Design a binder for these strands. Structure first.
Ligand code: DCP
Ligand code: CA
Lengths: 974, 411, 399
DNA sequence: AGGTATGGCACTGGCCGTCGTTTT
DNA sequence: AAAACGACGGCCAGTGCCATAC
């Protein structure tokens, strides 16, 4: 209907009729009275909201009697064949290992009692599969071992058996393992440990068209069943604060520990040499049999682990949607073209330039410092007095010119004398010394002449070294810097006369007097630490954004950039040296940390014959261009909350100014004739918590102040919770997200005020404290009413804590069980914050699973030509044919709608507010970027995507525009 | 100021030539100075060699070209350019009374329209070779022609001639990529200038437009008195090429992928004399500890320093020391390392004065031989950058130096 | 002759066919040189510089300018520079015309500037200040390489690239030094030639100046001068510094004396032409000396996968360039011709060795090598080619 | 008590290989 | 001429801080 008892615009009449049941029970009088009293007391019962337009859609027919049955049937239909294959694996009888491993190239199947026969492909419905790669030769797969019911299979690479001078560095599908049966039935299942890495080496996985093959990961199921958190992992490894009964039921993600936990018996032994990581191709050739044996051992252990694991997973997560979503999450796919190569170069070179300018600036400062050795002048430098200036002795074992004609004699005599004196090498020690003439501190900075990476001067210097601040003579409020072992970086305040390789304290006092003539210590800051004794001075820690306990590791941290602008942090040379150094550091930090991961991404380029016909004929088909793909190595469940993990693509930064290589995601570009259609959930966890509280309180949407405020705020009007908080405190909305989610999940007031001070440079201590207090007192009150009762969010906190303290906590929507390592019996009250956050985070995981299931169903039903591309914890992208780009958008919106209603249905509510029915915007683009309008200008590409690469702007469309462009139908002819 | 000290140093150590009053800023910038001393010649040669290596050596589509220093034939009337005239041309007209009343005033038209001019830029000569240099690459359109040479500019005697040696590249590109390439070179050249600089920030770039609406870039160096232009990049389109070859256009076609087109012309032109002066100012670096290290030295880049090594002797048996020094001198010279033969000068000063003189001359290393060198073959070595002393065996010296320069390119 | 046609076709001599002739090339009023000619001239200049300047402590570079401003000698023969402003000023208010033509043409000689005719005067203008560098040790020299302008009979202007050495020596030993320099220069000219006998020396005398020598090369049409050595005494040095002679004094055996001047001047363009003629002496090929050949090695690909062979050749090309060997990248053309034509083209360009990379090279690493002189084919491993070429060049130099 | 994940560089410490000096 | 021994140097492993994503 058009409204609920609290006058909140609910779902349209037609949509509500199509989705929810007609005979929905009405709320009682008492519940409505309580909700109205609550809202009036908080002061929200008056505000009238302007209604939003109405949407009328003839949705595709549903199955079952309600939403839950519909989703269950869809998930079962999706996941039936792969569950059948897993069951086939569970009941397998495997013969013993072959007596000897074959040497031929390709695939060999081992028959009974050792017989070996060459086969093109394993041709099995299920497998346990493992691969090994020679890291010295690059990324080409080296050799693989697979097992199926009643058969062993071995695969040898062409680069392992044959020897040739040159192997191509560009990787084609012809250099990967063939594993897919051509056009005994359609579906195939592959099981492995860290199975994504093995999937990355399959030739058929790189086709633009999707494949029926799916993959299951033993590590993901271990995380689902008995995983541990990072802190728990560290404690578990160190066990070789009060409760410890959880140790015996948990383990780390390493294969050996998993096998010990789920199977036991004889331990698993590694290969001590570690040839595949450190050896060479010849070393692999010589040790063929042993490496094959180890590979087979690992495969067998993984097979046993899966046999033990599967029933427990099926028991602790009984809803089929979880398995369907996990299956769908393992088929990620990223397209790329030749531009990727250029992106690797442009960034790298740029980085080097910014490196060079930095090193040249510091190296020079080092050189002049060497001149201070003479006369012990270094004993007077406030920054360098405490360095190592000792030299080392060199070691040894115990009249009128006239034209001439006989120049040959002079030449030969000089050459002979030179060579005779050259031969006196018998007295030279066999191990050359390393710059004994220079000082020790300068000696450390220089490489050794034998190093093949040698360069002149102290070319190892960097901004992160503890000597660089001394060389730059950094000053803080007119005080020189200093490093203490216990307390990190601080500064020295002169004036002590209680005597608090000797400190040149008079030089420091003179320097401070010079500084002062430009405008029990008498200076106030992080407080003196008398445990550090530097006669004639006090040591004061540099303030840290996380409090006085933490230690500063480098004054050139990004957070110190404003202090440079304010002039509190000043460099000795003066001018723009310090600010420029900090700017360069900020600009190159991300690339410095991530270039090894980014440049080593495995890329396979599809030949022309393997491309779709719709791509060759497109007018945008760039001939002489390269088209390829990258398959992210995502662990479907690498987190206790069952989130995904990827070393590179889940840490990629968005295109940002003044950050080299920030256009990483923009390089993922659809091929000609293809588009990327994507969407992100709006205020996901906020809404989840709000609806949980609403269900707990009175069973109506908006019956709580928190949910009431959450529902109405619009993104376009800038009235959502994030924007309101940002305006109230005066920070970016991105920082507002951090502030709000920190407050929600147990952050204390000191943390919030420190965060505000960090994000708002113009604030002060008292103002930040007041703005934190005026936002922490209203949300929560006192514990209870006997001498969470009061507060806007009290009901939500009570609901979350009730779920957390349950004997077997489960996700309210799908009822997945939390890991055995975090149940109350194993841990009494230890890791409360993690358990509380788990409810909402695993609910978000369930949301992702439901979205994936719905999208797959909609794409299959209406013959939509597209496939899943990628997701990051709340966002989904799809690769679609251009002509269908609009239809897909509609599907996404519908997938959102149902996904919301399901969340209400399992909570006992039979209606959905109109506000959260649809995605605020759906993005249609040709590359991956946060917004469709950004041109992504960075130091690595100044011109931008539009000019350098010719990628035009995308489009963002809402529900009404999509309806106008599609007429509300998903059919291929409207 | 510090500029006077730098100019005095450059005069004393024969970087420049002339007198104090002749070496004014205006004369140096305009190119109407007496000239450069041997050290300046060596520095300019090193700069030109580095430019040639960075522009021509490592590219398969850039070829050398030579343009004559003068342009003969008829000229359009005007432009105030100088005119080349032989001796007897001053007599064969006046004699015989060739209408000696007033027609020899209209003879100024003949003077304007018949006498040749001195080369003003390298662009025209390069464009003159476009057709015949198309055979090298079978008409693969993206390619360049490079040259280094002296050009003459009139400067307000009443009018003098300023000579400037400059490096020019003319790059023919497909039109649809002309802008992209214009960016590329703009970065590439900007890197090169920054490569050898101690303070690469003082090198800057700026966008600019022509009265015809043609994009361009200009590179400037920040001298102590302000920014001065050192290089220019112009996207000239095809107007000049079409005007130079009016007629059948198909003769000018080149290959862009599978298509035949007429290329856009990108012209890059940089001044080598002004670049040398800019590097001289940069190396002198005109903070208590830095101030107290008031040592005069020209910290030129090792790839550009005119002199690499200084060789001398101690006190002892003169003949043997001179023999070993001669051997070392010949060995160092035979492998491409320039040396200053200090051993051939009598003793007149202590080590402090030699260090000061060699620092003012920007010599990378100072080598010292003694009796103990004859005893065991160990020599003393002092480095310009740090001034620290090291002991080293002669058997390795030739290699070490060859390493130090060779790796300097890859810092 | 066929040689000039080959030079035109292979980009040694620039311009069209009609613009090339014996007289034009000898005079220096020809269109110019192609890139191969430019590289050959540069190699010749580098050899001259290393032979004359590098291995001597008392020879220094000099930086003479191309023109001399200010008042000039009246009359005399040379190229003067005229001002268009000084004639444009008459276009608006005539200065009575009539009788001022002869006076104006005399003012032309009075005030006009002149183009450099030789490198001797530029060096003489640096003698006094360059004497400081040697602490007045009288024996020492100044060397330069540069272009000079010569009238040629409407008079035309010819440009010649020349190498000049000015040697100041005590008058006692001037003749001995003249003989020494004659010997050394003759040896240097004979060094790179396949037929050293075609280089000859002769003695000559002048009314002004002392004994002198001339160096000639025997082109097919006769002997042509390529270098001249003169013992000019001290007339010019005094004439440039009238009156006082105390500054002009230099040291010799602890006594001061005014030095005698020896002038050596050689023509680089004519020398390049002579070497081109020398090398050409039933297969058309230029056996230019390895130290002077503009291009050392040519590279090409065989039949096979284009990307792989192109990557291999790119790596080899980068490696060869990094070590100082000039390379002709023929692999970019995709080998659209037979092998005989390719060999003929590379021979006419005077390339020392031809390198061919085939698909078979991907297997074991063997490339085909052809030699310009012997024409014998060989198989060599890629890893050894660079060192082989470097050793070959070194051996050619040492002999 | 924010939660969950990922990774890199700088610095410290321990072990073991290998050399040159000193005994026999 | 062969063996004990004290020192230097390179690799591996570990801890801390900082920087990314949601
Ligand atoms: N510092 C953070 C960032 C994110 N999250 C969680 C909760 C968020 O809901 C979820 C998704 O992150 P967004 O930044 O995409 O969050 P919204 O969905 O709230 O943002 P918007 O509606 O602006 O897209 O990640 C968190 O707990 N702490
Ligand atoms: Ca979101």
């Amino acid at each position: 209907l058009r409204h609920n008892p609290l006058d909140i615009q609910m779902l349209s009449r037609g949509l509500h009729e199509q989705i929810f049941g007609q005979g929905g029970e009405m709320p009682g009088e008492a519940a409505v009275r309580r909700s109205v009293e609550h809202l009036q007391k908080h002061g929200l019962w008056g505000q009238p909201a302007v209604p939003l337009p109405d949407v009328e859609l003839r949705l595709p027919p549903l199955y079952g009697d309600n939403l839950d049955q519909h989703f269950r049937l869809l998930a079962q239909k999706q996941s039936l064949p792969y569950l059948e294959a897993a069951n086939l694996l569970l009941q397998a009888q495997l013969p013993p290992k072959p007596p000897a491993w074959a040497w031929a190239e390709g695939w060999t199947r081992y028959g009974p009692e050792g017989e070996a026969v060459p086969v093109a492909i394993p041709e099995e419905r299920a497998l346990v599969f493992d691969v090994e790669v020679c890291l010295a030769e690059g990324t080409c797969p080296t050799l693989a071992v697979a097992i199926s019911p009643s058969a062993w299979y071995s695969w040898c690479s062409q680069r392992l058996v044959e020897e040739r001078y040159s192997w191509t560095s560009q990787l084609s599908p012809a250099d990967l393992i063939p594993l897919e049966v051509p056009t005994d039935w359609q579906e195939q299942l592959v099981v492995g440990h860290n199975v994504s890495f093995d999937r990355a080496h399959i030739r058929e996985q790189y086709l633009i068209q999707g494949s029926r093959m799916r993959f299951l990961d033993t590590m993901s199921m271990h995380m689902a069943i008995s995983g541990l958190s990072s802190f728990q992992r560290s404690l578990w490894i160190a066990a070789k604060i009060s409760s410890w009964d959880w140790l015996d039921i948990s383990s780390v993600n390493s294969l050996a520990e998993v096998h010990r936990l789920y199977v036991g018996g004889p331990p698993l032994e590694k290969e001590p040499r570690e040839l595949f990581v450190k050896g060479t191709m010849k070393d692999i050739r010589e040790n063929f049999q042993d490496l094959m044996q180890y590979c087979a051992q690992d495969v067998w252990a993984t097979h046993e682990v899966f046999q033990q694991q599967l029933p427990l997973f099926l028991e602790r997560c009984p809803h089929p949607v979880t398995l369907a979503g996990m299956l769908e999450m393992g088929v990620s796919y990223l397209p790329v073209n030749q531009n990727w190569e250029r992106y690797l170069a442009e960034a790298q070179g740029t980085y080097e330039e910014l490196q060079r300018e930095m090193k040249k600036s510091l190296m020079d400062l080092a050189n002049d410092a060497c001149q201070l050795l003479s006369g012990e002048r270094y004993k007077e430098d406030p920054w360098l007095w405490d360095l190592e200036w000792d030299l080392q002795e060199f070691k040894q074992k115990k009249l009128g010119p006239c034209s001439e004609e006989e120049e040959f004699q002079q030449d030969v005599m000089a050459r002979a004398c030179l060579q005779k004196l050259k031969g006196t090498t018998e007295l030279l020690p066999k191990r050359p010394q390393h710059l004994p003439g220079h000082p020790g501190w300068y000696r450390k900075l220089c490489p050794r002449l034998d190093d093949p990476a040698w360069t002149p001067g102290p070319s190892l210097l960097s901004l992160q070294m503890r000597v660089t601040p001394k060389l730059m003579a950094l000053t803080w409020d007119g005080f020189p810097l200093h490093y203490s072992e216990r307390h990190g970086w601080g500064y020295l305040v002169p004036g002590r006369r209680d005597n608090l390789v000797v400190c040149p304290y008079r030089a420091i006092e003179s320097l401070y007097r010079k500084h002062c003539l430009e405008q029990p210590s008498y200076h106030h800051g992080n407080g003196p630490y008398n445990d550090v004794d530097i006669p004639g001075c006090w040591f004061f820690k540099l303030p840290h954004k996380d409090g006085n306990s933490c230690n500063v590791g480098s004054p050139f941290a990004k957070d110190f950039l404003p202090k440079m602008e304010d002039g509190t942090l000043q460099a000795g040379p003066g001018g723009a040296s310090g600010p420029r150094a900090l700017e360069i550091n900020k600009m190159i930090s991300f690339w410095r940390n991530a270039h090894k991961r980014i440049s080593s991404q495995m890329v396979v380029w599809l030949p022309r014959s393997a491309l779709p016909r719709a791509v060759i004929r497109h007018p945008d088909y760039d001939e002489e261009g390269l088209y390829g793909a990258i398959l992210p190595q995502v662990v479907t469940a690498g987190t206790i909350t069952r989130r995904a993990v990827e070393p590179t693509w889940l840490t990629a930064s968005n295109a940002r100014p003044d950050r080299v290589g920030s256009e990483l995601k923009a390089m993922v570009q659809a091929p000609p004739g293809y588009t990327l259609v994507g969407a992100d959930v709006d205020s996901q966890e906020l809404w989840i918590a709000a609806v949980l509280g609403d269900a707990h309180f009175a069973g109506m949407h908006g019956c709580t102040a928190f949910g009431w405020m959450t529902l109405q705020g619009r993104k376009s009007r800038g009235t959502d919770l994030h924007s309101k908080t940002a305006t109230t405190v005066g920070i970016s909305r991105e920082h507002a997200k951090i502030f709000n989610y920190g407050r929600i999940y147990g952050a204390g007031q000191p943390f919030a005020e420190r965060l505000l001070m960090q994000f708002n440079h113009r604030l002060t201590q008292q103002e930040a404290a007041e703005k934190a207090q005026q936002m922490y007192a209203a949300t929560k009150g006192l514990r209870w009413y006997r001498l969470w009762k009061g507060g806007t969010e009290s009901e939500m906190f009570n609901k979350l804590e009730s779920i957390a303290t349950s004997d077997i906590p489960r996700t309210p929507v799908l009822g997945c069980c939390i890991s055995r390592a975090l149940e109350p019996s194993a841990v009494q009250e230890e890791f409360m914050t993690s358990r509380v956050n788990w409810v909402v985070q695993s609910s978000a995981v369930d949301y992702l699973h439901l979205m994936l299931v719905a999208m797959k169903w909609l794409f299959e039903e209406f013959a939509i030509d597209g496939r899943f591309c990628i997701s990051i914890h709340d966002e989904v992208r799809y690769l679609v044919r251009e002509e269908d780009r609009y239809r897909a958008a509609l599907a996404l919106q519908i997938t959102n709608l149902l996904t919301r209603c399901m969340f209400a249905y399992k909570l006992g509510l039979n209606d959905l507010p109109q506000s959260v029915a649809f995605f605020s915007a759906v993005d249609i683009d040709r590359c991956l970027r946060k917004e469709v309008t950004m041109d992504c200008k960075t130091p690595s590409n100044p011109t931008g995507m539009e000019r350098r690469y010719g990628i035009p702007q995308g489009e963002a469309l809402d529900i009404y525009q999509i309806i106008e462009l599609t007429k509300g139908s998903l059919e291929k002819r409207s | 100021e510090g500029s006077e000290a730098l100019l005095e140093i450059c005069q004393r150590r024969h970087f420049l030539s002339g007198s104090k009053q002749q070496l004014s800023r205006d004369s140096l910038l305009s190119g109407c100075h007496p000239g450069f001393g041997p050290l300046g010649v060596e520095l300019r040669k090193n700069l030109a060699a580095e430019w040639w290596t960075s522009v021509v050596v490592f590219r398969e589509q850039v070829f050398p070209v030579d343009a004559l220093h003068h342009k003969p034939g008829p000229l359009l009337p005007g432009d105030s350019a100088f005119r080349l005239v032989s001796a007897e041309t001053l007599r064969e007209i006046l004699q015989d009374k060739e209408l000696s009343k007033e027609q020899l005033v209209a003879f100024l038209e003949n003077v304007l329209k018949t006498s040749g001019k001195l080369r003003e830029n390298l662009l025209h000569g390069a464009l003159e070779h476009y057709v015949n240099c198309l055979d090298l690459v079978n008409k693969r359109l993206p390619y360049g022609l490079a040259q280094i040479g002296v050009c003459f500019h009139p400067v307000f005697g009443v009018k003098s001639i300023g000579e400037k040696t400059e490096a020019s590249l003319v790059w023919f590109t497909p039109p649809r990529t002309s802008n992209q390439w214009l960016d590329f070179w703009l970065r590439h050249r900007l890197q090169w200038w920054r490569k050898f600089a101690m303070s690469p920030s003082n090198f800057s770039s700026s966008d600019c437009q022509d009265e015809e609406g043609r994009k361009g870039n200009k590179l400037y160096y920040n001298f102590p008195w302000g920014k001065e232009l050192i290089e220019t990049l112009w996207n000239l389109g095809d107007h000049e090429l079409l005007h130079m070859y009016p007629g059948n256009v198909s003769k000018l076609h080149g290959r862009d992928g599978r298509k035949n087109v007429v290329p856009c012309v990108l012209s890059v032109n940089g001044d080598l004399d002004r670049g040398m002066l800019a590097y001289l100012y940069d190396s002198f670096q005109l903070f208590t500890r830095k101030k107290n290290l008031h040592r005069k030295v020209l910290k030129l880049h090792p790839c550009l320093a005119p002199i690499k090594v200084a060789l001398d002797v101690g006190r002892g048996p003169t003949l043997e020391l001179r023999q070993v020094c001669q051997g070392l001198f010949n060995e160092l010279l035979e492998n491409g390392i320039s040396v200053w033969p200090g051993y051939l000068e009598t003793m007149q000063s202590s080590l402090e004065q030699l260090y000061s003189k060699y620092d003012e001359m920007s010599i990378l290393f100072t080598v010292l031989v003694t009796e103990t060198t004859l005893e065991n073959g160990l020599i003393h070595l002092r480095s310009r950058d740090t001034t620290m002393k090291e002991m080293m065996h002669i058997s390795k010296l030739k290699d070490f130096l060859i390493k130090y320069i060779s790796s300097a390119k890859n810092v």
